[PDB]
Amino acid sequence: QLRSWNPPSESVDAALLPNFTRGNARADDLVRNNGYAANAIQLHQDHIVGSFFRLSHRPSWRYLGIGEEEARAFSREVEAAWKEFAEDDCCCIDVERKRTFTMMIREGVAMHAFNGELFVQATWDTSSSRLFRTQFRMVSPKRISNPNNTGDSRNCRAGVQINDSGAALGYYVSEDGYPGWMPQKWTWIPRELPGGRASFIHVFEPVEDGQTRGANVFYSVMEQMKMLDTLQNTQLQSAIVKAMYAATIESELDTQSAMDFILGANSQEQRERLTGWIGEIAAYYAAAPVRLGGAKVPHLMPGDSLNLQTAQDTDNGYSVFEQSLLRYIAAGLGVSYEQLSRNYAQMSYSTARASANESWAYFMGRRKFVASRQASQMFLCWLEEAIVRRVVTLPSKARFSFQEARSAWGNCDWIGSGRMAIDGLKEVQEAVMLIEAGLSTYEKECAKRGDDYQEIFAQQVRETMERRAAGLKP
Amino acid sequence: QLRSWNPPSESVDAALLPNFTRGNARADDLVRNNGYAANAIQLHQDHIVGSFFRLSHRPSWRYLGIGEEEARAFSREVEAAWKEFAEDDCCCIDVERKRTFTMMIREGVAMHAFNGELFVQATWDTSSSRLFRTQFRMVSPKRISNPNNTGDSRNCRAGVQINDSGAALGYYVSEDGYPGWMPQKWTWIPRELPGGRASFIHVFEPVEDGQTRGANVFYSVMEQMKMLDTLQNTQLQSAIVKAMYAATIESELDTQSAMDFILGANSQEQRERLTGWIGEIAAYYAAAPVRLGGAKVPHLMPGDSLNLQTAQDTDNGYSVFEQSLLRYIAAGLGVSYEQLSRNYAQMSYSTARASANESWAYFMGRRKFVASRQASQMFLCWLEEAIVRRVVTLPSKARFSFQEARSAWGNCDWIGSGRMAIDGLKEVQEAVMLIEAGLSTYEKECAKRGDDYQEIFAQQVRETMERRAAGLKP
Amino acid sequence: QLRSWNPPSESVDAALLPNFTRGNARADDLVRNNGYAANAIQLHQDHIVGSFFRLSHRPSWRYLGIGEEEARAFSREVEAAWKEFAEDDCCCIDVERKRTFTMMIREGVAMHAFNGELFVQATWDTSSSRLFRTQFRMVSPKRISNPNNTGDSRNCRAGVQINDSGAALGYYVSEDGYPGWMPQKWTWIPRELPGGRASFIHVFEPVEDGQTRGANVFYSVMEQMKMLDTLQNTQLQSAIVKAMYAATIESELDTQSAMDFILGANSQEQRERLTGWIGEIAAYYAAAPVRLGGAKVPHLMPGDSLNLQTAQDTDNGYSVFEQSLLRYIAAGLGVSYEQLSRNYAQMSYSTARASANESWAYFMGRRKFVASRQASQMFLCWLEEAIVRRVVTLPSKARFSFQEARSAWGNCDWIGSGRMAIDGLKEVQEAVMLIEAGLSTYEKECAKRGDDYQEIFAQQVRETMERRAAGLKP
C-alpha cells in the first residue's frame, strides 16, 4: 500500500513558490464563497484582536538608568499622544483614509490568516494639516511579485530580494492592474530606511530556514471543504430522487414468437395494425382520462414496461459523515469544532470550557506572534516621528538616545479583547481569590478582562468621591 | 501468522539511515497536506512552549562559594540584559532577521517533532550596530548530508563526522538548492569552537547507543493516516453511489428460439426488421416525451434490460472505524484523543482531567528534554558574549572563572506556558491550600501559571502603595 | 482440545536463548512501526521516571557510628556535587555526549522494557578538562553475543561468561556492524574491576535461577498486535467492498437447444450473426450513450449475466472485538486499557482513579526494581571517584572506609515524577489530613509530588522573610 506513495523531498520554498499564486487564489475563493471559511476567519477576527486593541507602554527604565516615576510620566505622555493619534475620526493614519488602527490590526491578522503573510508600508506625508505626517498602507501579497513575472533566482524570489544569508533587502511591489487594460509596473521598495526607520514591514510565521513567503492555513483543508460541499449536493440529489413518482400505463401483448411474426408483418405491410391500435387506445383513454395525480399517466408500448431499479437502500450516514468532516476542518484551522459550526448539542459545561481553553491558548499564541509584532512596528514608527517633532520629551538623564535604544524606549505590550466568561461567577471568584491571596496583581486581571488598572483606579477614586460628595454610601 | 513475519535485527541507524530521506519527505508531505498532522504539530507548538518562554537564572553560588545575595544581584542583572536582548524588535538575534527568540524555540521544537532533530548555528556578526554580535540561524536537517552524496562510512554517516567512540566531531551542511539549477556545495562545520564555545548545536532524542539522527514520531502512524484518508474517499464514494438512480424503458420480445430466428433473418437480409421498428419507436416517443424528471428515459434493445446488482446492504460502520483510527493516531503521537480529534462528546469532567494529565505529563517531559536544552545552549553562548564585553560583571571573589564553570554560572531554568485551569475553582483551591499549609512555595505555582514570584511581589507592592496613596482600601 | 497441546518442559534459558535474537528483532519492529507500542513505551518513560530523577543521599550513620548532623552535612555536600555533575550542559557524563542523566535513566528503562535488560559501561576518561573523569555509555543487548557467533556452552551463553554458580564473570561485547562491510569483533569485559568498582553493569529482572538474559514483555502480546493489524486491514477492505457498484447491460437470448444450434452454426460457418449483432449493438449504443453516471455502462454477450454474491449480511462486531484486543494488550503490557488506548468513554471518576492506581502501583514496582538499581550503581561509581579526588570529605571518625562500606555510605533513594492528581482537592485534603493528623511526614508528601522538604523549607523561609521585608502579610 505505502509502496505507491513516494513524495520527493524539497525545501519549503521549492514546494510552495511554484503553486503560490494558485494556492492564494484558491484560499480567496474559499474565503469569498464557502460559509465556514468566512465564519472561521471571522472568529479569528473578533478573537485575536477583538473590539479594540489598547497599547501599554512599558519602557525599560532600568536598562536606560531612568527614574521609574520619570518613566511612568513619559509612558503616560506617550499614551496620551498615542490614543488621540490612533482612533482619529479622519482616518488620517491611513493614507487611503478608510480604516482606523483597530481595523488596521484586524485586516492585518485576517490577511495573514488567509494568505500566510502581511505587508505594511509606512509613508511620510507632506500635508501639514495634521501634527503627524506618518501614514500606513497595506499591500496585498499578490501585489508582491518578480518584475515582468520573470523567473525567480537565488537572490530574487517571489518579488523579494534576499542577501547571501536570506535577509530581505527589499521588495518588488506591483501596481494595481484593475481594470486589466494597463500593464502592471513593479517598484523597488527597500525594506528599511537608511536611518533605521522601518519603511516596509513584512510579518509572517516561518516554519523553516530560508522560507520567504508565508503559507495560508487553508492549504491543509481545501480538499475537505470540497468533499463537504460535494456531499451537500449529492445528499440533496438523494433527497430529490427519494420523492420520485414513477407511474405508467402498459400493455403486455408482445406475443414472443408471434411478436416477432407481427413485427415482420408490420415491417412488410401491416403497420395498419399498430396505427389502428394506437388510435383506438388514444380514443379510449381520451374518453377515460385516468388522472392519478395532476396529469395524464403516459401510455407505453406493447411489451414495453418502465423499469427503474436502484442501488443500496439503507441509511446513508450523512450525520456522522459531516460531523467527521467539520471536525477535520476545525482541527486543521486550529479552532474548536463546536464554535466553528455553532453545534453545541449535548455539550457539558466542563467540556465546553476545556474546548474554549484550547482555542483560547491557540488564539493568544497567534495574537502574541502576529498582531503584537506588527502593532509594535507601527508604534515604533509613530513614536520616532513624535520624538522628532518633540511632541513628547525624552528623560534628560537618558543613558542612550532613542535611535540607539529604540527597543528600550519602545518596549510596549498590547491588550486585546479579554477571555469572555462562559459562566461568569466561577471566574469572578477566580480573580477575587487570586487578587486576595497574593498570587496575582490587578494589571493582569484587567488584562484578561481587557482593561488597564491605572484608569480603573482613577475612575474608582472619582466614583468614591462623587458618591461621598452626593451623600451616597461609598 | 507469526511464522510469516520474520523481521531481521539491525542497529537503529542501519534500520533508519537508508530510508531517512524518504521518511522525512513523507513526514513533510503529511504535515503540509493532512489537517490532523497540522493540528498535532500546532498542539505540540503551543503546549511544549506556548505564548512565551521566560528565563530564570539560578547560579550555583554554593558550588562557586559566592554570597547568595551577590548571586541574586548578578542573576537580576543578567536577566535584565537577557530580556532586552531576546525580544528585540529588530530580530537581531536571528541572522536572517525574521524571528524572535520565542518563535526560535517554537520552530525548533516543531522541527524536532516532525523530523526527529534540530540544528542551530551560532554566528559571530561583525556589525557593531548592536551591543551583542552573537546571532543564531537554524539549519533544516535536510541540509545535513554527506558531501557529493557519497557512500556512507563508519565515521561519516548522513553528513555528521564521528570519532572512535562516535562523538560528533563536526557536520557537513549543504547549501540551499533552490532553484534546482546549481550543484549543491557542502561545508564542514566543527561541532564546537576551539575555546569550548558551542558553535553548532544538534538537539535530538536518541533511543539507543550509536544513533546519529533522530526519527520523527509520524514513523509510527503514517499508514494509519493513509487508511484514514482512503476511508474518507470511499465513504464519500458510497454517499455518491447510494444516491445513484437508474430508469430505463425496455421491451422483451426475443422469444429465445424466435430471437435466434430473428437473428438469422436480420443477418441474412432483414436488418430492416429492427431499424424500422426502432424508427417506429423513434416515431412514437417523439410525441411521448416520457419524462421522469427533467430528463428523458433512455430506450434499450428488445430483450436487453439493465441489471444493477450490488454488494452487502448493511451499515458501513464508519462511526466506530474512523474514531478508532483517530484514537490510534493520538496514541501514536502521544496526545490525548479528544484534543487532537476535536471530538468532545459525552466527555466527563474527571476523565477530561485525566486526559489533560496524560498530555501534560508528556508535554513537560518533551519541554524539559528538548526546548530546555536548546534554550540553555543559546543562553550560554549569549552569556559568554556578555561577559566578554563586561556587560555583566562576575563576582570579584569567584572561585572559578566563567570558562572553567560554564555550567555553574549558566545554571538556568525556563518556564513556559504553564498548565492552565480546567475548572478554575479546583486548581485555585489547590494553590491556596498548598501555600497556606506549607507544602508549597510561591514560585512554582507561579511557574505552573507561567509567572515568577519576584516581579509578582514587586507589582503587588506597587499596587499596594498606589492604592493606599489614593485612599483605597489596601 | 487439551490432548492436542503437550508443550515440553525446558529451562527458561533453554526456551529463550535459541529464539532470543529473532524475538528482540520482532519487538524492535513492533515498537518502531506500530503506534500502540510506541505509546506504551512513552507511557513507561513518563511515569516510571518523569521529567527528572532527583537523588537523595541517606547515609547509615547509625551503622557507621557517625554523628547524625555530620551525616546530614556530608549528604548535603555530596548532593551539591552530584547535581552540578549530573545535569551538565556538556553531557560530559556521557561518553557519546548527547544524553544527560535523566534521559540516561529513560533510555535504560525503555531499553529494559522493550528488550528485557540493559547494559551500562563505566569508563575512566583521561581528559582533565573536567573534574570528574568517570563517564557512562550504554551497550545495546544486540551487541552482546558469543564471539564469532559460536554455539553457547555451559559457561558461555549469549556472550556472557558464568562461573560454576552461574555468577556473571564477564561479557563479550560486539562492535558496531554498520555499514555491514566489516567483520564484527568481540571484546571481553570483566563484570567488575579488581578493586570492586563496577566496570560493567547489567540490569534485568530474572524469573528463575540460571536465567542470563532478560525477556522483553512484548513476548506476551505479539500475535495479538498482529491480529489487531489484520482486523484494521480487513475492516478497511470491507468498507471499500461495501461501496462496490455493479451495473451493466445484459440480454437473455441463449435459446437453449437453438442456442446450441447457433453455437454449432457459428463454429462451422455462421460467426456472421454474432459479428453483425455486435456491430449493430455497438452502433446503437454509440448513438445512445446510456450512462449511469460519468461512465459508460458496459455490455455483455447474450446469455451472460454478472453474478456477485457476498456471503453474510450482518454486523462485523468490529467495535467490541477491537475493545477486547486492546484490553488484552493492556493486560499483557501491565498498563490500564484506557491510558494505552486513550478511551475515557462513559468512565466514572472513582473507577478511573482506581484503574490509574493499579497502573501506578505496577509502575512504582518497576521504578523501584529497575531505574533505582541502575541509578544507585552509577551514583556509587561517581561517589567513589569523588572520594578519590577528595571533592567531598568523609567523616573523620568513620568506623569503616568507603571501600569496606560502599553500601553504607552510598545508601541512597531516588525520587521521580510524583503521583499526578486526578481531581486535585481530594489528594490535597489527603496530604493536609495526614500531615496534621500525625500519620505522615513531609517527605512522602513531597514524594508523591516530586519535591523534597529541605529546599522547600529553605524556599518557604526565604519567601517569608522577603514578604516581611516588603511589608506584605506573612
Curated annotation (Swiss-Prot), chains A, B, C:
- Write one Gene Ontology MF term: structural molecule activity
Q: Where in the cell is it found?
A: Virion
Chief subcellular location equals virion
Please indicate which superkingdom the organism of origin belongs to: Viruses
Keywords attached to this Swiss-Prot or TrEMBL record, sorted alphabetically, are: Capsid protein, DNA-binding, Viral capsid assembly, Viral genome ejection through host cell envelope, Viral genome packaging, Viral long flexible tail ejection system, Viral penetration into host cytoplasm, Viral release from host cell, Virion, Virus entry into host cell
Q: Which GO terms describe its biological process?
A: symbiont genome ejection through host cell envelope, long flexible tail mechanism; virion assembly
Q: Which Pfam families match?
A: Phage_portal_2 (PF05136)
According to its UniProt record, how is this protein modified after translation? Proteolytically cleaved by the viral protease during capsid maturation.
The terms describing its cellular component in GO are: viral portal complex
Subunit comment: Homododecamer. Interacts with the terminase complex composed of two small and one large terminase subunits.
Family according to the record: Belongs to the siphoviridae portal protein family.
Instruction: Describe the function of this protein.
Output: Forms the portal vertex of the capsid. This portal plays critical roles in head assembly, genome packaging, neck/tail attachment, and genome ejection. The portal protein multimerizes as a single ring-shaped homododecamer arranged around a central channel. Binds to the terminase subunits to form the packaging machine.
The name on file for this protein is Portal protein B
Q: Organism source for this protein?
A: Escherichia phage lambda
**Upper taxonomic classification of the species?**
Viruses, Duplodnaviria, Heunggongvirae, Uroviricota, Caudoviricetes
Question: What is the primary gene name for this protein?
Answer: B
